[PDB]
Amino acid sequence: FNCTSSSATVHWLGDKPTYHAGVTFGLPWPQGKYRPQETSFSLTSELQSWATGYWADGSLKWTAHAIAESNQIYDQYTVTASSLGCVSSIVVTDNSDALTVNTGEVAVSFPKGGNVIIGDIKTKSGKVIGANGRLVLQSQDSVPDNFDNRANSPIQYSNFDGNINEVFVNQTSARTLVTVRGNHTVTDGTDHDPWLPFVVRFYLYANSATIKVMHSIVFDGDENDFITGLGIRFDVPLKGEEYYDRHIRFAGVDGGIFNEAVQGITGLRRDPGEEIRAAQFAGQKLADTETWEPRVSTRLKWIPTWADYGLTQLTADGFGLKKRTKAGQSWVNIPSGTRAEGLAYLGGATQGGLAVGLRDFWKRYPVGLDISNAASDTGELTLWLYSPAAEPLDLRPFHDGLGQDGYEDQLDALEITYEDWEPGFDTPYGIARTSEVYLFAFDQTPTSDKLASLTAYMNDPPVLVAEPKYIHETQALGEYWALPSPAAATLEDRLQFIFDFYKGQIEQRRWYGFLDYGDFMHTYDPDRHTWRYDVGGYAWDNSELSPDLFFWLYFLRTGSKDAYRFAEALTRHTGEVDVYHIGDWKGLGTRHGVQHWSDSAKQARISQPQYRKYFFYLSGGDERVGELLEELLDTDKTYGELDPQRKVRTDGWEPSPNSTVSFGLGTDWSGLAAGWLIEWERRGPRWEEAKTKLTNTIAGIANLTNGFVTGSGLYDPVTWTLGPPPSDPGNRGNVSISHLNAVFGLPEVVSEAIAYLADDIPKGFKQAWLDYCYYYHASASEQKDRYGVSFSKISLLQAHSRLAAYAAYETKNKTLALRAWKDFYASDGLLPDAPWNITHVDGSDVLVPVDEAAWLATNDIAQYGLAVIQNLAYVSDSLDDYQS
């Protein structure tokens, strides 16, 4: 028969790297081109392939591919897909106890139960270089009021271990993913029930001794659980190794490395030999002692032996480093520095060893690294994701309620700090955070140049990506954007400006930390020259008005590394820390506030899977994000437990059991719809359900009289249908407009759902959408002639310009296009003749020098960028017509 074939080409995200340890990348395909399992793939050899997404007709939409570690590194990789009629391997082995993965360079064994995540790590030769990878956690039960209170407020410490429940394996030749889940169980200390659920993923690639370790946790503790240390630990066997042949290294600042031995032979009073000393520094096995100069070799007993080393990064700006002969002795402080790049190695020239490290180490402070008992038969190497040298992690609420009593008071407080408080809602119960850890194995102590390289690898892991242009052709990732007229040029320069300022504010406002890193804030205080870190709703942004959409689309269009890294970090924060992953509110995220979990507005607009979609697919179906997207399918359950509109709805409705549940058609539904469309696209375990709930609710909305202009609907949790809201039992017509409904993914989700449903789209839905896009900011007359009232509380007109643009493009209407551009250039948001620059502030006005743009807030820049991107993609033809 026929052959349908095509090529697609994948490039390195920034500069071509000098080292990579295997990579997984994604590739989109046009609707209807290639059948799954039928279509073969080759790289420029056979190429590890698998599907992450499917079109509605079940053809391939996104794939994921993997290549082995190789020192041949090319500029472009070309994947050729060929249909049915056209013309280095990992070895996993199974025992009763444990599963072994062997890449050709390392063999790592994962037990199937117990408190040891990794049994041992061997190199090619077979020598054990590390053993007993284990999770550590320690906690306390009280916290003292202040430092003075420690004398009359005892502390009870508890250590814990990772206990395994399930081990899963996804084996291919090129890469194997081991997924280990469990809980943290007590060991020593005061007694405590199992808590702090974990999942730890291990990506092994063929021909690599680098292991990427995605480590995720859910906080399920309460008010009395104060995390004290969090980390990963290995034993490093040293027994047959002369102390002068045992090596310690830490990564330093930039490309630095600290280079010591457990028994130092350099810097002594006597010279063993110039060759010998240079060998120690180089991590080499020293010559036989018979060649040393005897005034040294006869005196080794008098040269101290250094068992413990500890690096502590407690601010984003400074680290301490210290070492100790053994316990019971004081530590000797070591010359330290600002920002450790966050890798440590323990091992030997003969026995080999292990480096462990954390990506973005100092940006996720307080962290640390420990070598211990390096004078013993077995040393330990520990990575602290949270350091005990830091203050205990206190997630409890930042204020006590202020004497607020009921919805009247809370809504009043809302008018001043923009925080909508409620008791019991200011809770971290069920948040998460994923930490990207790296293990490197070595047959012998490696060179310093090598450790610095693997350190830099870790902090900027190579990424392969599709050409932006190719992505656009396929329509596999939205149609609401195009690739980058003098007027348009200054739109792009303005997006560049927004991006440069936000990337800059991360550093200047010091938006780093275990949980904080990734987010940014909402509104600025012009008097104090700070962002409003301490005023209610004006603090951490938590995806308010879809900055996630802006930043990801900004990456798609450009292919910029900086863009990808900014959006990646954002995604790793807002998807983990700003949403609940367990409990009654599971699948909701929390409105912008002072803590990431302080506000009472738990809503699906924060936990909005559209925000993670672009990263899910571009990363090659990142499994952690995959898991997170599956969690959000239980978001509909919450409307039975919690009414997001509970404080302000006027119609007397409340949730009862076995009843229908209310939700908005823009805010809430946009998040549900997107969850359902992603699962459908993925064909996951719950895809038939997802297709039914999306398909029904769409038909629901079409068969409402006023369509989207209806405020909300009533949804059935058992039958999965959508009917009129409480105050219109007979679907005669309700009008309830909100300025929030469109700005959290609605148009993006709807355009994707319309395209995906193809000829099966419920009659009149597309037109109900066009009706919203058209009449939101039409004249009050055109509104009263259509729905009987004019739309009262309209605002965000710049932000809604991209709706007019959608309708304009789709209805081929040049008049509407000009109204869209008029709304963009001459309503609100960021006017074109606003200051469009930064002002520098220093001296006694501020703690440190900063750049500011008091004239913008994050609500403005997110919707400005989305408007620009979308207005240009839909109606750049009418832009020149608008300027003249």
Ligand X SMILES: C[C@@H]1O[C@@H](O)[C@H](O[C@H]2OC(C(=O)O)=C[C@H](O)[C@H]2O)[C@H](O)[C@H]1O[C@@H]1O[C@H](CO)[C@H](O)[C@H](O)[C@H]1O
Ligand Y SMILES: C[C@@H]1O[C@@H](O)[C@H](O[C@H]2OC(C(=O)O)=C[C@H](O)[C@H]2O)[C@H](O)[C@H]1O
741: tokens are: 């409904």
Cα–Cα distance for residue pair 860/489, rounded to 1 Å: 20
Q: Which residues of 30-59 are buried (b: 16+ CB within 10 A; e: fewer)?
A: ebebbeeeebebebeeebbbbbbbbbbeeb
Stretch of residues binding ligand X (CB under 6 A), selected from 193-201, 344-352, 378-386, 640-648: 640-648
Binding positions for ligand X, 542-581, rule CB under 6 A: 544
User: Is 578 one of the binding residues for Ca ion (CB under 5 A)?
Assistant: yes
The nearer residue to a copy of itself, 229 or 237, going by C-beta atoms, is: 229
Binding mask 742-761 for a copy of itself (x = CB under 8 A): --------------------
User: Is 253 one of the binding residues for a copy of itself (CB under 8 A)?
Assistant: yes
* Residue 583: burial class (beta carbons within 10 Å; 0-12, 13-18, 19+): middle
User: Is 667 one of the binding residues for ligand X (CB under 6 A)?
Assistant: yes
Q: Which of 19, 41, 50, 157 binds a copy of itself (CB under 8 A)?
A: 157
User: Is 299 one of the binding residues for a copy of itself (CB under 8 A)?
Assistant: yes
Binding mask 798-827 for a copy of itself (x = CB under 8 A): ------------------------------
Q: Which helix (H) or strand (E) holds 495?
A: helix 486-508
For residue 94, count other CB atoms closer than 10 A to its CB: 10
List CB contacts of 268: < 8 A, sequence separation 6 or more: 296, 303
User: Out of a copy of itself, Ca ion, ligand X, none, which partner does residue 542 contact, by CB within 5 to 8 A per kind?
Assistant: Ca ion
Task: Give the dihedral sign, CA 603/609/612/614.
Answer: negative
Stretch of residues binding Ca ion (CB under 5 A), selected from 13-21, 186-194, 516-524, 730-738: 516-524
The nearer residue to ligand X, 351 or 667, going by C-beta atoms, is: 667
Binding positions for a copy of itself, 485-514, rule CB under 8 A: 509-511, 513
User: Is 189 one of the binding residues for a copy of itself (CB under 8 A)?
Assistant: yes
Number of alpha carbons in the 13 Å side-chain half-sphere of residue 623:
20
User: Out of Ca ion, ligand X, ligand Y, none, which partner does residue 666 contact, by CB within 5 to 8 A per kind?
Assistant: ligand X
3-state secondary structure of 871: helix
- Minimum Å gap between C-beta 272 and ligand X is 20
Task: Give the chain's largest Cα–Cα span.
Answer: 104
User: Is 451 one of the binding residues for a copy of itself (CB under 8 A)?
Assistant: yes
Binding positions for ligand X, 725-784, rule CB under 6 A: 738, 740-741
User: Is 519 one of the binding residues for Ca ion (CB under 5 A)?
Assistant: yes
Cα–Cα distance for residue pair 283/151, rounded to 1 Å: 47
- Minimum Å gap between C-beta 525 and a copy of itself is 3
For residue 378, count other CB atoms closer than 10 A to its CB: 14
Stretch of residues binding Ca ion (CB under 5 A), selected from 8-16, 52-60, 595-603, 861-869: 595-603
Stretch of residues binding ligand X (CB under 6 A), selected from 107-115, 264-272, 426-434, 599-607: 599-607
Interface residues with ligand Y (CB under 6 A) are 414, 420, 544, 591, 601, 644-645, 648, 740
The two beta strands, 128-140 and 157-171, are: antiparallel
User: Is 294 one of the binding residues for a copy of itself (CB under 8 A)?
Assistant: no
Q: Which of 102, 603, 638, 870 binds ligand X (CB under 6 A)?
A: 603
- Minimum Å gap between C-beta 601 and ligand Y is 4
User: Is 603 one of the binding residues for Ca ion (CB under 5 A)?
Assistant: no
User: Is 278 one of the binding residues for a copy of itself (CB under 8 A)?
Assistant: yes
- DSSP for 656-690 reads -TTS-EEEETTHHHHHHHHHHHHHHHHT-TTHHHH
Cα–Cα distance for residue pair 523/529, rounded to 1 Å: 11
Beta strands in 809-865 (DSSP E): 839-841, 850-852
Cα–Cα distance for residue pair 19/460, rounded to 1 Å: 11
- Minimum Å gap between C-beta 154 and ligand Y is 40
Task: Tell me the helices (H) and strands (E) count for the chain, helix number first.
Answer: 20, 36
In 262-322, alpha helices (H): 274-282, 294-297
User: Is 664 one of the binding residues for ligand X (CB under 6 A)?
Assistant: yes
User: Out of ligand Y, ligand X, Ca ion, none, which partner does residue 752 contact, by CB within 5 to 8 A per kind?
Assistant: none
Task: Give the dihedral sign, CA 577/583/586/592.
Answer: negative
Stretch of residues binding a copy of itself (CB under 8 A), selected from 123-131, 237-245, 336-344, 723-731: 336-344
Question: Site residues (CB under 5 A) for Ca ion?
Answer: 519, 540, 542, 578, 596
Question: Site residues (CB under 6 A) for ligand X?
Answer: 420, 537, 544, 591, 601, 603, 605, 644-645, 648, 664, 666-667, 738, 740-741
